[PDB]
RNA sequence: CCCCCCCCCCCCCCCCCCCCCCCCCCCCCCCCCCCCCCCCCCCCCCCCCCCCCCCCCCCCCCCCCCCCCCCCCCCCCCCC
């Protein structure tokens, strides 16, 4: 029969990669700091010091942010997530030791984490510069409140909030979203910026952009931290910020998949076009594949997953054009750097999409009027 | 087919968070006091001492309130709810020891709980100041009745009654409801304020506001206590008041969800508007998601649950406007700090909603008249 | 290379208390068993017999095209 001549390449390609006999393990490096729950409270203090510091140096805040995320996970878990990702990890412990150094003649004590990635010499400078800003703050308002100080439990998550904004715009993969990351960090997190002088969206976002670029394994650590953080029963409003901002990243690097359902929902006439209908057999395979993966496919582009290319609709020129045209006519895209392969289908879809959104008459058949 | 091009993001996002391989555990601190049933009666006495004290210092009453709630749960259960919430707990026992101290020269005995969070030095001062108010009360009325004294079993729940009022207005998350908490504590719980001089709604509410802010894990303990308290077969009228005041918190931080059903019930014409109907596919998903969760979604904003953002209708500008307008026209909102994204839909919905509530004619078809 | 060790607190015990006590042999009857009839077997009958190797042709496969991605967006706020 002619019904039998078929070949499910999409399912077979997945079967090949899923049943690999051998494994590659990428060079994570010489060592990774794996802090446990006992240090979490010290890192939150370190995160607070950077936040209270006016015009703070956020060169290490991307790294310090990851240390807080790993301390929340705990040494056992964060090692487990690195090994499950596919990395040989040389686990370095993290705890508190008292360092004595004579700054400006007078001998001073400092509680420092003995980290491999972060030197004890730069850790004291974060505390030194924070004490300067603290006494300046204390001189201005007399008594500093619990909100404005570094001891607040939000401090650690406040730094991870803009980390979730950075992870939201990692799909582009060229620090192009930085403008949107800062923009949202002013619309969102506005109360937090009032109570902390050193909440600099541009400076902190670039730090997280740097640490995710330099260390691709830490983006896997943050994503699985964010999912673990979002799996909790309840916390604070700042943790509610992080959870909401983190879930905005879900479905990044695959907007054409969502806009394709929109074109189907609004019933754009150019979907029924002949050349678009020729592709419909294969576009359903990727949508069914997206339905198969489920929640797993959300961070397939944020984490540069090999199977992220399978979710692409760009391989279908005609369907992509009408979907990208529908988005243009409804006026939801811009400045989206996706170009339609078929320009005629794009313009026709844009024209009909503009006609769909016109005027606004009341539909009385929807209501249960007697 | 074009019916297959779909993607249930709401269900897949839940599937991602529900199937997390790893877990985060937040720094609960150095230690938590986990009192058992044997101390419950001592804390009730301590709660009574604060209530009989005229112009009492309710600095520790928020913490003392949590200790009574945890004593009612019992060491085994309160440890279980902290671990299920996602917290590493260092359980400190709570029981009675006799402390001898010479106040004003004369050596005096005091039954004190050896708590970590509460010092033995401040515990005796609660008893000392209560004895002053007790003898002043005894001098005025001669013989103090069972209602006015600290030994009454209601004392512990009376302090937790305004804790339920604080939890009712935690959705705002900025002590803005304090005015309403004091207001309702005067309308309801009025008989209790007559029999206790130290029932200060403003002072006690601020104490619970402080302890929930400083310790986010205790708000999880109180919510699960209130549900466990509400699951009882029956009790006193004060316990009945607490159960009623606690269930008023159910559905906090999601009033737009309830007002949306009201607009559908009253049949506001602006629901059938074109731009509102475009959102109807996605607004049903969140209502069906709210129906899926059931009783679990009640305290999703009180407990700052990551999945609380999923219940938001604010993401839909047009539907939110007509729903917020319907509430304005019926005259049920105010001073609600929610602003409509679409002003024209809000005004049109408000206008029709005002026309719905006019006059009042008798409908004789409703009755079974022969 | 570096480096004594040690250091507190503390007899134990203490009360109350014999046990036992009654009633009661057992058994007793009836009753050998068996008994008859009866060897078994007997016939007929080797089996087999023919025909027949199998195989034989034709034929590498393959060859094109193609990263992906890029937008926007915390939530909440009343009353009871």
Numbering used by the authors:
A (entry chain C), B (entry chain B): 2 to 371
List sentences from the manuscript.
Like other Paramyxoviridae, RSV has a non-segmented negative sense RNA genome that is coated by the viral nucleoprotein N to form the nucleocapsid (NC), which serves as the template for RNA synthesis by the viral RNA-dependent RNA polymerase. The structure showed that the N-protein has a core region composed of N- and C-terminal domains (the ‘N-core’), with the RNA bound in a groove between them. In addition, an N-terminal and a C-terminal extension, called N-arm (residues 1–28) and C-arm (residues 360–375), invade the 5′ and the 3′ adjacent subunits in the RNA-bound ring, respectively. The NC is a flexible helix, with variable pitches and numbers of N-proteins per turn of the helix.
Here we set out to determine unequivocally the handedness of the helical RSV NC by electron tomography of purified NC-like ribonucleoprotein complexes (RNPs). The resulting reconstructions showed that both MeV and RSV NC-like helical RNPs are left-handed, with a pitch of 52 Å and 68 Å, respectively. A composite subunit was assembled including the coordinates of the N-core and seven RNA nucleotides most closely bound to it, together with the N- and C-arms of its immediate neighbours on either side. Although the close contacts of the N-core with its neighbours are scarce, there are a few key contacts between N-core atoms, in particular the interactions of the Arg234 side-chain, which links three consecutive subunits. Thus, Arg 234 from subunit N−1 makes a bidentate salt bridge with the Asp221 side-chain of N0 whilst simultaneously hydrogen bonding the side-chain of Tyr23 in the N-arm of the second neighbour along the chain (N+1) (the subunits are numbered in the 5′ to 3′ direction of the RNA along the ring). Modelling the helix using the COM of the Cα of Asp221 and Tyr23 from protomers on each side of the subunit as the centre of rotation about the radial axis, rather than rotating about the COM of the whole subunit, resulted in a model for the helical NC with minimal clashes that preserved the inter-subunit hydrogen bonding described above. Superposing the N-core of one subunit in the ring with its counterpart in the final helical NC resulted in a root mean square deviation (r.m.s.d.) of 3.9 Å between Cα atoms in the immediate corresponding neighbour, with the largest displacement of about 8 Å. We have demonstrated that RSV has a left-handed NC, a feature that is in common with other Mononegavirales. The most important implication of this finding is that the 3′ end of the RSV genome is located at the pointed end of the NC, and not at the barbed end.
